[PDB]
């Protein structure tokens, strides 16, 4: 219902994070960030309200109600997996007992299933972040109002690799640097194809359950061409499939972390009224409020058995 | 061309089946950078 705008946001956010610097690894969670600012979208007043929905690529043809309820069916569908893969999302809101409007409370309790001393608050927040993510995000405090969200992912490959064919092969970093990483090896039938619009190989490996990973191997020099012409319409076309060829797959194992504070990037996406003095947060409190930072952290793990990822957001 | 090696920097998506929304997106340039 809101997934086409959700992928466009994931790509708009991806471009600026990658355009900022292409010299390091990138890993973030679009759903966690989207829910964080969509949760705040219910407690914000005009001209900050609007910039928030527009910054999530939403106003034009959809009402504000149908947007918030898309996220309740979103988070309910994700928090209800047919458990072969482990997937859970959690929303937190750490108030400090002053003043609340209590209409913001009823809205976030319904739509998003949400649940001074610096040391006590810091330890309490990070335990809530480390509890749901199974200790993946452990070390992710300013003032009265804090909103936190977390996601946990743990799936297994439909056709797992064997841990004897994983040989250490070269990895081309920048046409001068070459590092050796443990690459997994497997032959057989794969859901692989060529775009002819992206100049890149597109490989889909489905996880056991309701999840699927897509891998884009760009041609020589076409890495930037891939990042610019990658849209929602093309991935849905790729997800309509079962044209499977056969090839030998060399997939490297992975373990990386994102750790982005992104107050600056969102301004480039239209959310400028985020930490502004003039920014209006009236649906939240009756005493008065503004944001100071927006930190996002996410970890990834790829092995022969499956994938284990977890992301968190702190506003 | 059955020689698909991921020895170059690449981009990956991690999308849910039933919801069709991307849960994770990333770009791998160096696996050793952990």
């Amino acid at each position, epitope marked *: 219902k809101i997934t086409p705008n959700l992928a466009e946001f994931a790509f708009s956010l991806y471009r600026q994070l990658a355009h900022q610097s292409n010299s390091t690894n990138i890993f973030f969670s679009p759903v966690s960030i989207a829910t964080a600012f969509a949760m705040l979208s219910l407690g914000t007043k005009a001209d900050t309200h609007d910039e928030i929905l527009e910054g999530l690529n939403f106003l034009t043809e959809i009402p504000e109600a149908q947007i918030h309820e898309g996220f309740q069916e979103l988070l309910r569908t994700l928090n209800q997996p047919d458990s072969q893969l482990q997937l859970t999302t959690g929303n937190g809101l750490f108030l400090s007992e002053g003043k609340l409007v209590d209409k913001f409370l009823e809205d976030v309790k319904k739509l998003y299933h949400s649940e001074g001393d610096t040391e006590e608050a810091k330890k309490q927040i990070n335990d809530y972040v480390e509890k749901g993510t199974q200790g993946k995000i452990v070390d992710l405090r300013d003032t009265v109002f804090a909103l936190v969200n977390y996601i946990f992912f743990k799936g297994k490959w439909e056709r797992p690799f064997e841990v004897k064919d994983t040989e250490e092969e070269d990895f081309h970093v920048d046409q001068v640097t070459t590092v050796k990483v443990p690459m997994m090896k497997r032959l057989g039938m794969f859901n692989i194809q060529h775009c002819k619009k992206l100049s890149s190989w597109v490989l889909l490996m489905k996880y056991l359950g309701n999840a699927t990973a897509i891998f884009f191997l760009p041609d020589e020099g076409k890495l930037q061409h891939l990042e610019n012409e990658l849209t929602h319409d093309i991935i849905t076309k790729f997800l309509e499939n079962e044209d499977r060829r056969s090839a030998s797959l060399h997939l490297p194992k992975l373990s990386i972390t994102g750790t982005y504070d992104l107050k600056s990037v969102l301004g480039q996406l239209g959310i400028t009224k985020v930490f502004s003095n003039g920014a209006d947060l009236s649906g939240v409190t009756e005493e008065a409020l503004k944001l100071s930072k927006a930190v996002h952290k996410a970890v990834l793990t790829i092995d022969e058995k499956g994938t284990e990822a977890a992301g968190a957001m702190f506003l | 061309p059955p020689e698909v090696k991921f020895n170059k920097p690449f981009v990956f998506l991690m999308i849910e089946q039933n919801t069709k929304s991307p849960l994770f997106m990333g770009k791998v340039v160096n*696996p050793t950078q952990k």
Partner: antibody
Amino acid sequence: LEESGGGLVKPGGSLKLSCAASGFAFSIYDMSWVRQTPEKRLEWVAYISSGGGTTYYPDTVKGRFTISRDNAKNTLYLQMSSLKSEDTAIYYCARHAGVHYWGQGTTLTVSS
Amino acid sequence: DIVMTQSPSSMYASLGERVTITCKASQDINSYLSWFQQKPGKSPKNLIYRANRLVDGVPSRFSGSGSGQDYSLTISSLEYEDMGIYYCLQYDEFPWTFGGGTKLESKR
């Protein structure tokens, strides 16, 4: 990767070895312990996959030795218990992805 | 449990001479065999993995072949930095067992 913690242990005692590592990820490689008996016979001791699952043990040491990872501090562990005279050997911590590289070892001496 | 028989247990050779040692398994191991070298005062170093693919950094003097149950290590032109004990590794199935070891010594 440089391992340490060896020494002399009385029969029936216990000891825990450590293999700290730097220069590579250590969170992406499989780790293992391998020993070298005084008779110059090498034999596999432990095998932990990457992350923590799943550990493998031969029947000679199953139930007595326990391998564990600490990827946060980049340290491999080998909890030894119920040691016998056969356990006296030079132990090695090994990272393997097809090719594996061993440390310089640490000597365990189990005698009364 | 696959027993790895390695022959011979000890042999002499001279500089530049061709040396060939063999490692036979108790069963088929699908060519998952690795060859090690140990200096007397230092730790084993990996030379070959998958029984025909050299480890990066090893001189091209070391060859190796074999299939199923009989595998061999060959040095085309022996050197003085190659004298030591050679071990053959089995990693086709758990537990991973090694060979008895081949002692390569210098002759004069």
